[PDB]
Each structure stands twice: as structure tokens, then as C-alpha cells.
Write an enzyme that holds these catalytic residues in place. Sequence first.
Site, PDB file in Angstrom:
ATOM      1  CE  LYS A 168      -1.670  -2.788   2.288  1.00 26.09           C
ATOM      2  NZ  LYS A 168      -1.536  -4.270   2.257  1.00 26.09           N
ATOM      3  CD  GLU A 176      -8.202   3.962   7.469  1.00 25.19           C
ATOM      4  OE1 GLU A 176      -8.303   2.745   7.217  1.00 25.19           O
ATOM      5  OE2 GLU A 176      -8.891   4.840   6.913  1.00 25.19           O
ATOM      6  CG  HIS A 229     -14.877  -5.784   6.794  1.00 26.38           C
ATOM      7  ND1 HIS A 229     -14.705  -4.417   6.780  1.00 26.38           N
ATOM      8  CD2 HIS A 229     -15.037  -6.131   8.093  1.00 26.38           C
ATOM      9  CE1 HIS A 229     -14.751  -3.957   8.016  1.00 26.38           C
ATOM     10  NE2 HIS A 229     -14.953  -4.976   8.832  1.00 26.38           N
ATOM     11  NE  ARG A 231      -8.307 -10.159  -7.912  1.00 25.06           N
ATOM     12  CZ  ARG A 231      -8.279  -9.193  -7.004  1.00 25.06           C
ATOM     13  NH1 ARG A 231      -7.273  -8.337  -6.937  1.00 25.06           N
ATOM     14  NH2 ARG A 231      -9.287  -9.082  -6.144  1.00 25.06           N
TER      15      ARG A 231
HETATM   16  N1  LIG Z   1     -11.708   4.166   5.777  1.00 27.22           N
HETATM   17  C1  LIG Z   1     -12.597   3.177   5.784  1.00 27.22           C
HETATM   18  N2  LIG Z   1     -13.854   3.432   6.217  1.00 27.22           N
HETATM   19  C2  LIG Z   1     -14.745   2.434   6.221  1.00 27.22           C
HETATM   20  N3  LIG Z   1     -14.592   1.166   5.850  1.00 27.22           N
HETATM   21  C3  LIG Z   1     -13.337   0.945   5.428  1.00 27.22           C
HETATM   22  C4  LIG Z   1     -12.311   1.863   5.364  1.00 27.22           C
HETATM   23  N4  LIG Z   1     -11.159   1.262   4.872  1.00 27.22           N
HETATM   24  C5  LIG Z   1     -11.504   0.013   4.654  1.00 27.22           C
HETATM   25  N5  LIG Z   1     -12.817  -0.234   4.974  1.00 27.22           N
HETATM   26  C6  LIG Z   1     -13.537  -1.499   4.860  1.00 27.22           C
HETATM   27  O1  LIG Z   1     -12.619  -2.549   5.066  1.00 27.22           O
HETATM   28  C7  LIG Z   1     -12.221  -3.118   3.792  1.00 27.22           C
HETATM   29  C8  LIG Z   1     -10.713  -3.135   3.708  1.00 27.22           C
HETATM   30  O2  LIG Z   1     -10.309  -3.767   2.467  1.00 27.22           O
HETATM   31  P1  LIG Z   1      -8.988  -4.676   2.464  1.00 27.22           P
HETATM   32  O3  LIG Z   1      -8.072  -4.215   1.380  1.00 27.22           O
HETATM   33  O4  LIG Z   1      -8.449  -4.770   3.853  1.00 27.22           O
HETATM   34  O5  LIG Z   1      -9.599  -6.100   2.051  1.00 27.22           O
HETATM   35  P2  LIG Z   1      -9.272  -7.115   0.856  1.00 27.22           P
HETATM   36  O6  LIG Z   1      -8.840  -8.420   1.443  1.00 27.22           O
HETATM   37  O7  LIG Z   1      -8.393  -6.424  -0.133  1.00 27.22           O
HETATM   38  O8  LIG Z   1     -10.725  -7.300   0.210  1.00 27.22           O
HETATM   39  P3  LIG Z   1     -11.412  -6.708  -1.124  1.00 27.22           P
HETATM   40  O9  LIG Z   1     -10.283  -6.163  -1.965  1.00 27.22           O
HETATM   41  O10 LIG Z   1     -12.119  -7.869  -1.777  1.00 27.22           O
HETATM   42  O11 LIG Z   1     -12.364  -5.635  -0.659  1.00 27.22           O
HETATM   43  C9  LIG Z   1     -12.946  -2.293   2.719  1.00 27.22           C
HETATM   44  O12 LIG Z   1     -13.353  -3.109   1.629  1.00 27.22           O
HETATM   45  C10 LIG Z   1     -14.150  -1.735   3.485  1.00 27.22           C
HETATM   46  O13 LIG Z   1     -15.230  -2.642   3.542  1.00 27.22           O
END
Ligand SMILES: Nc1ncnc2c1ncn2[C@@H]1O[C@H](COP(=O)(O)OP(=O)(O)OP(=O)(O)O)[C@@H](O)[C@H]1O
Lengths: 91, 91, 422, 91
Positions: C120, C204, C239, C296
Site C-alpha cells: 500500500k 486513519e 467486509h 486483475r
Molecule cells: N476508511 C474506511 N472506512 C470504512 N470502511 C473501510 C475503510 N477502509 C476500509 N474499509 C472497509 O474494510 C475493507 C478493507 O479492504 P482490504 O483491502 O483490507 O480487504 P481485501 O482483502 O483487499 O478485500 P477486497 O479487496 O475484496 O475488498 C474495505 O473493503 C471496506 O469494507
Amino acid sequence: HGEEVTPEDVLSAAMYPDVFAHFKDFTATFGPLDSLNTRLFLQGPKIAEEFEVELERGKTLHIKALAVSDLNRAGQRQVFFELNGQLRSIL
Amino acid sequence: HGEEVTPEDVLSAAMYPDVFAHFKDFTATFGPLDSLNTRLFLQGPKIAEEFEVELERGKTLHIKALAVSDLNRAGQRQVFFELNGQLRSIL
Amino acid sequence: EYKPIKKVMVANRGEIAIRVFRACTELGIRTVAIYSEQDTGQMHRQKADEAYLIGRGLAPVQAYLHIPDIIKVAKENNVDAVHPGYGFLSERADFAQACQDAGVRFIGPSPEVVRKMGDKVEARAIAIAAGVPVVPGTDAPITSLHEAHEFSNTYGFPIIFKAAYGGGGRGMRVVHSYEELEENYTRAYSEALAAFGNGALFVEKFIEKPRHIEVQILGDQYGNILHLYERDCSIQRRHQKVVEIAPAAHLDPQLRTRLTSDSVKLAKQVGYENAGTVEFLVDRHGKHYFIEVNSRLQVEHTVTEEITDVDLVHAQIHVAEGRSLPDLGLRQENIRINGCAIQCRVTTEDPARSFQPDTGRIEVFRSGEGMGIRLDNASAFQGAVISPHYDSLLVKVIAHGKDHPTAATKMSRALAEFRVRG
Amino acid sequence: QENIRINGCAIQCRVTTEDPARSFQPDTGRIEVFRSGEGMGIRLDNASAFQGAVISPHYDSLLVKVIAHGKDHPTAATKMSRALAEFRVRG
Ligand SMILES: Nc1ncnc2c1ncn2[C@@H]1O[C@H](COP(=O)(O)OP(=O)(O)OP(=O)(O)O)[C@@H](O)[C@H]1O
Ligand SMILES: CC(C)(COP(=O)(O)OP(=O)(O)OC[C@H]1O[C@@H](n2cnc3c(N)ncnc32)[C@H](O)[C@@H]1OP(=O)(O)O)[C@@H](O)C(=O)NCCC(=O)NCCS
């Protein structure tokens, strides 16, 4: 019969017409033989066990035997087989 | 265990809580009844015959007994019935 | 214009294998499939010209992760290109490098772009480089309670701990106090150090009312990039995605064009060159906050595929060949919106206890196909056994109609017509 | 009138148990294996097609109504050709 061209089968029929005709009929009926396991070709699948048969470099089949029914209406049993993921029933 | 209570259900619980509990658990586990004939209810169907079951006047569904497999694993037999126009297998 | 492809192999299982096989068979290309020993009864190997076994002495989930075996299979069968699908070595930069070193084309972005994505820090640095504003938060990973306290004091009180080593939920917990703040920080740090690898956490603000928008990005090898359109999938159980809506529900047109232009600009700056996904996040007053970039093709591409009526896998293969977009007849002024679509994922999760996965044997299966119903049968058939080692997806059902309520009613009818027993 | 517009092209084919070789003479029997060929632009209207189905010698002989939709005529033809190749109705 057929539209296949080669001299080898012509020669074989020249040595033996009748056996060649019978073999050609059998092959046209039952398709590609000699791709089976020897035990599979000799006795056949055991009940409810998964076996594997290959057909080509990439053509491979897994078949499972489900069950065999009894004479339904004209002495034509229904035998139940499973494909790689599917199931089959045959008269 | 209740889902339908009416004052007569309270009354039955007042007389026979035990057999009422046994009744309701047995029936809710094994679906509704009263749609089967005596042959079906006490003895059941046979292989190689089609019979009929009337649930409610709107619907009537056909059943045919194809075959039953042998116990394999986890004590979970599979049997092959056909509902009208399809084939079914039940765990 | 360049060397054509004569044979293609896929490195996934399930619905993606079927979709790619159909796309290749439409173009008269031979197909090669791979499978593991446990995954021997699936339907994704009967739809391929040839299928080969891999991971003979490995774990059921790690058999699909063995690079040398896949490379050896590719070498001996004169394979020209390999498709990475999604979630199976697709986001591993080393696999693309290995494929390139063996003379086989890789269907997707270059390994450099994949390495730039992933972690990230580089993504955030690139996004902040030009425009595309991101959520307030720390730049470097946070591992200390004290620095967390200053970042809590500066911006705002409600915060969320975001972990590294996995894009998944991980320790997705929120802080509303201080007494619970210290203990939650300790617990999350302990979990990150023990159950996971790097104890990288971030401080954050948690958007109270999130609403995130996705955009599909398509680009060629000649520096021409085409965006398809937006999406909405705000429905999330905890999530994870649940239900997707193909067009935007209620978005301002100015916001629409601003977000589209920002996505195109970000794709251009990195110089992206394949089917790619750009995610976002919108607040109630209206604040587009960048989240991440997916390198992807996403599993919810089908709904975008039907509004535009442009086949994504065909374009992906064609751009892998080398043909430019104008030759294919694809221009941003040539595509248009037509109707609405809804997608629902059918799983084997008990919707009462905890959404806990359930395993067993399917005894009754049936399907419903109508005017606006498209079906993608992955592993659902009569007498099928569902395994607890892999994902729990049965069927991907898509409904299309001229309006949102009409599509919803059609999908409800289709779901009622389905019958899954056992 | 103003709200109706053309969008794409479509092709229709009917799968029938007729023998195209001799005289398109209809055939009767039991279906042993059936599979579907749904895809991107494929719409399927299954009248009566399933494992162990029986085709009546006295009613009509329609098996499946297959519809293929595409952006142009050659594309629809290619899609229909691939969809027909996926269908497997043996016996
Ligand atoms: N600032 C934020 N405010 C609210 N919800 C958030 C925030 N940041 C992340 N989230 C929630 O948490 C998740 C974090 O995504 P993360 O990258 O950790 O998951 P991932 O394993 O990549 O899943 P995917 O890419 O399929 O969503 C987001 O999809 C959202 O649902
Ligand atoms: C092979 C083909 C040219 C001719 O098929 P056919 O004449 O009907 O019968 P074939 O014995 O020659 O081969 C097809 C059979 O082998 C099976 N099989 C096919 N490819 C296989 C593979 N890589 N691996 C394992 N099994 C396979 C098929 O399921 C089919 O079985 P079925 O039709 O009896 O149910 C074509 O029909 C085919 O099956 N191609 C592969 C799948 C395909 O083309 N899908 C199109 C969309 S991806």
C-alpha cells in the site's frame, strides 16, 4: 463403409476380409478401445469405486459406478454411472 | 419447540405435554403427512411402479421408485427417486 | 499484427476456467486445463481439450501454488500464453517473471506494474503524486501506542486499525474511547505479531457512512486506455461483497465524470496495460477517497459486461496478441449504457448462525432461465459433493432488465425458481 | 413507436429428434445424458430435456429451443456454433 483412407487397412483386409469387417464394425460401434486399464477392460469397474481412464495426452476421464437396476420393461436394465462430476444412466 | 400455538395447543400441552412434544418433533422433522394412502403410510412404495400422492387440491405430484444404493460411508445412503419430470437423489 | 496465439492454459479452477475456455473456443484456440488430485470431480476439466494433474504430493490448497510444476507443464505441451484468472498466482509478481523467462506470454500487466501495486505504501505515494485524494492517515506503518495517540489527537477521535500482510479484514476494529483504545491497540498488535507477519498497522479515520465505487480499466500496449463505466457494491455482510449493481444508484454526473477522469489519469500515470480495477470511496457530503488498485480482472465484471455488451475476455486476449483498440473497434465515444443489471452470489453459508460455511452432498439441483437471466454454473450439478478446502460458490446468477425494480423482480423470480436440496 | 429500437442481432435454432440423413424421420427413445450450453449471449428455453427422459412417439418432437444473441451476424453465428458444440445429448 466409411470415408477413411489408408493402405494398411486395405492390406489387412487383403489378408483377411471377414475379420477386418468385424473389427471395423466393432470399432465403429464402441469407439476408441485400448485406452482402458487392463483390469478395467477385462472385468469392468467395481461397485462404487472411482477409476481413471485416459484417452489422449490431455484427455483423461474419471468415472464412478453408482448402481444397477433390474429388468424394467423389455429386459433392459438401467445402470447408473458417475462422470468426473456428473452422473450417468444407461439402458 | 412451538411455532403455531393456539389455545387448543395450550390445552393439549395441559393434558399431554410429552406425547405432544414427541408428535411435533417427529412430524416437523419428517415433513407433513396425511397426503399418503395406507399402502404408502404403513408399508410404503415399491420399485417399478408409479403411484400418486395428493397434498392439497391445487397440486398432485407423481413419484416413481427407480433404485436404492448400498451404504458406503458416514452411514449416509443415497436413493434415486423421480418426481414428475425429473430425477431425485436424497441423503 | 504480431505473433498469434495457438494454445492457452489457465491457472485457476471454477467459473473462471469455464469463462476463459468459452472465450478461447469462440476464437478457435486449443485449451489446456490443470487440476489437483482432490479437485478431480469438478466440471471445469470436461470443458477443456486437455487436462493435466499438478501438485501430486502437496496440500489441497497449495497444489495450485507450485510454480515449477506449472512451468514444466507449460513447457512440454507447446503452450503460448497462460491466463492467471483471479486469486491464483494472479497477484504474485514472481509468477509473471517466471512465465516471461520461459518464453510464454503472460495475460495481464507487466511484472513491474504488479510489483508497484500490492503493497500500500507505493500505491499511496503514487496516488498522492498527482490528484486522486486519499483518506487522511499515516504514511509509514504505525507500531507504537504513543504515535497512535498523536495521530488520534490531530485528525479526529474515531479511528480504525488497518493491518498489513493481507488485504483481508484482519484486525478491522474501531475505537470510540481511550480505555478501550489502549487494550484494543495491545490486542491488535499482539494478533498482528503472532498470527501474522509484519506488525504494520495504520491510524486513519473511519468514514461513518461509506459508499464505494468501482471502475473497470482497459488499456493496450500502445498507450491507449479505455474505461468501461462505474459500479456500486455497497452491500457488505461484514467486509465481503454481497450484491452488486451495474450502474451507479444515485451519483451526480459531475462526480461521475470527475471520478472517471481521475481513474483514467491514474491508469495513465502508472502506464497500466490490461484489464484492471480502480476502487474508490464516497462520503455523504461527497468525498472521493482512493482505496487501492486491483491488477486483475474482478469477479463482478459480468454486470459491466452486459450494460456495455462488450466481451472483456475477448478484448483481453486480443490485446495480449498485440492488436490495438481502434482495430478492434473500441472507442470511448462508441460505447453506451443500456439498462441495468444485478448480480448475486449463491453460496453454502448458513445465513442464521454466523454465516458459517456448510458442507455436504447436493441431492436436488434445478435452474431457472428466462428473458433476462444469465447463468454461470461453476460446480453445481446433480449429485455433487462440496469440499471444505476451497471457496464455497455454487452459481453466479445475473439478471438484466430495462430498470432497477424490473431487474430486481426478475432476479427474485429466478431465485424462487431455483431448487437446491440437501 | 419512438421508444422501440434495434440493438444487435439474434439467431434461432430448434433441436429436434429428427434424422437429417434419411428423410428427417423423427426418432423415439430415452435420453441417457443431457448437458446445457449456457454462455455469454445464450438464452435457453428447455421444454423437456433431462436425464432419463422419454420422447413420446405421438406428440411433437421439440427438445430444446436455443437462442443466441450477438452484436453482429457473424458473431451470433460463432456464438451459436460454440453453444451447439457444448450441448451433449447422446443415445
Ligand atoms: N476508511 C474506511 N472506512 C470504512 N470502511 C473501510 C475503510 N477502509 C476500509 N474499509 C472497509 O474494510 C475493507 C478493507 O479492504 P482490504 O483491502 O483490507 O480487504 P481485501 O482483502 O483487499 O478485500 P477486497 O479487496 O475484496 O475488498 C474495505 O473493503 C471496506 O469494507
Ligand atoms: C472434442 C469435440 C471436438 C468433439 O466432441 P464429441 O464428438 O461430442 O465427443 P468426443 O469423444 O470426441 O470428445 C468430447 C467428450 O470428451 C469429454 N472431454 C472433453 N474434453 C476433455 C478434456 N480436456 N479432459 C477430460 N475430458 C474431456 C467431453 O466432456 C465429451 O464428453 P461427452 O460429450 O460424452 O459428455 C468437442 O465436442 C469438445 O468436447 N471440445 C472440448 C470442450 C469444448 O469444446 N467446449 C466448448 C466451449 S469451452
